[PDB]
Symmetry: C3
Subunit: 247 residues, 3 copies
Amino acid sequence: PAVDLLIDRLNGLLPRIAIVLGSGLGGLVDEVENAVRIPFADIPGFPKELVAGLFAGQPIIMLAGRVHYYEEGDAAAMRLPIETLASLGVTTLILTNAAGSLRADMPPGSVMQLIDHINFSGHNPLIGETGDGRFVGMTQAYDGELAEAMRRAADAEDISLSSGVYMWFSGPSFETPAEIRMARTLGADAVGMSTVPEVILARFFGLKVAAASVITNYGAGMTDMAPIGGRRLVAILKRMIVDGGAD
Amino acid sequence: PAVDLLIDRLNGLLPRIAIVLGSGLGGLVDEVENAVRIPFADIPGFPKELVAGLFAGQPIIMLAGRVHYYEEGDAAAMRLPIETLASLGVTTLILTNAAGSLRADMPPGSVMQLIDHINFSGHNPLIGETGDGRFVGMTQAYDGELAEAMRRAADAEDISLSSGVYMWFSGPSFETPAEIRMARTLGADAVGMSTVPEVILARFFGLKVAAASVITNYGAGMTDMAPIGGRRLVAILKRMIVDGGAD
Amino acid sequence: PAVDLLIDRLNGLLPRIAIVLGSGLGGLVDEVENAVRIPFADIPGFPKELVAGLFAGQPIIMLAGRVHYYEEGDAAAMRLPIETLASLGVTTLILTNAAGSLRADMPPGSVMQLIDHINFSGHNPLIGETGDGRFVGMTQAYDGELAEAMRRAADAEDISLSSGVYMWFSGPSFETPAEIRMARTLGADAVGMSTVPEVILARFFGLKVAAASVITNYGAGMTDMAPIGGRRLVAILKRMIVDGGAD
Ligand code: HPA
Ligand code: HPA
Ligand code: HPA
């Protein structure tokens, strides 16, 4: 159904990797050779565009935008697209986002790869699903091989890449200083309103996952770098993909 | 629509301040000169009465009662009234409630002003809202100037006023001793089932916020003063308002 | 309505105790003298079978299975059955489940009775209920007299019985290592996706509650005994019931 349309649309392009673009990274859609832009509304069932082509000399699909849980209160907003990506032969999903840092040592404009997360005030996107596949193990949701490759790519470009735990809050209002003190007490390094439900759905669909946050601000109570933060992340990603033949 | 009705009803009274009355304080509606009582059912859209008149020689609207999240599972129950208050020219919202104390040093009958909160098992009232106004900063949700005035008024009446962080639980069942141990570990000073969603909505609508809890009990596992607690709070409020010309 | 059917079905059997059977314990339904099996679909309103008869020489109802919050997103799934049990004259509810251990000292195959719980990412089953009965005190949700009897029965059989706090996560995906570190930091000894909403509903309906988890695994990041774990629990339960005349 959705799979059918995209297959027609893709020239017979066969990407192994898809990238969900967070705020600040929307522009990456432009640096895509032989690009094929598909609006979300053309795609039946999809909840804002899908772009497929060559990036870093390798075939990719990008989602410019995503629907967040806070928008309609639907944590499974991204279920159908993620399923569709899986059915197109994508084996790897890279998720990017904007986040607040809970660490002095990790200022705005820093990039942090996710090694784990905490679902705090989100809802679980697999509620209402049937069959035993729903009991998804999440011990290594963030693929160890991909997390290493990203680290190696950052070192090759000589960009700092932090590592840490992302805590998901529903939003859309930001956190109070007390909620931020709690988040830290609970073990998070950064907070945000996205990504986690897509990681869960990805693991449900058998996709390997990497993720990274651009730090745009310190968390509330601790008191624009979002563009250079994003250019840093893009450079790590590009380098990561060129170095990977079978990635 | 709702604004229209209240404007007709209010004699051309123009309050800057509204007070949401928690359990125990319902009676304050009676000590209101030139009072104008409006039942909630007369007001179209409202989810229990609205009372406007002179209090402490100053124009006020009071909500005797509120709809809690636990009643129908609607965290935005109070959205329409709070919006309506804003549209009537109210610039300041004072929220009162009953809460459980997590501090030995803060017994039943104490009054605690809120300097911050933690939304624990509530839902965010702005889920499903559109436009960038929904990304409400909550760094100083509890107005610093109002929190000081309340403190000064308490000292002038020689009433103790505690200060602390309120944690919101959905309810309607109370917390277990283990949940109370957690609440403290997470940094709360008091717990309850109200207020926080109205603070969020208020900040969304540009209103300055003050809040205070009457402590009616210690939190579960730590083991009637609710009336004197309320009379203490009323005395602080009255004093706060008489001392403020432009409040 | 549901009460009517079960009364007809029960031969005029009058159980004081009901047992909700978790994964692994379904088989206990077989060791029930004079058994009367009733499928859930025969029972009007029920959300998988109800079995009543003699167990350990005493009259009992067992629920083989339960509907979890994660299945349809309905935390009050078990409301109607629990109410129905109360209306049949059941005064005591024993809940069993599978759980993950957060303690080295409590390995897979251990049995842990619940002395308290933490509702973490569950929803409260009493949201949407009317009347003052909904404000259920939960200071001693796990009956002290029943918890002692279970302990005494374990010692008589010479089985180890741990004691601790169960934290409820919605599921259906399992917890990340970071969520497990948090659960411990918040004071839990074991985690799972069940039981807590039924404890709340039970207390709402005036039933005394005992609960126990079979430990099937360590919690994520810390790295089959579920059958012997269950046989241990069954032995404690049997011994507990034979020793109780008025239990
Ligand atoms: O501090 C934050 N909190 C939540 N979401 C965010 N997205 C960017 N920064 C933040
Ligand atoms: O201890 C409490 N818990 C929750 N709500 C409350 N409202 C008054 N006291 C309490
Ligand atoms: O580790 C666990 N987590 C959640 N539910 C469970 N049920 C059995 N083990 C577990």
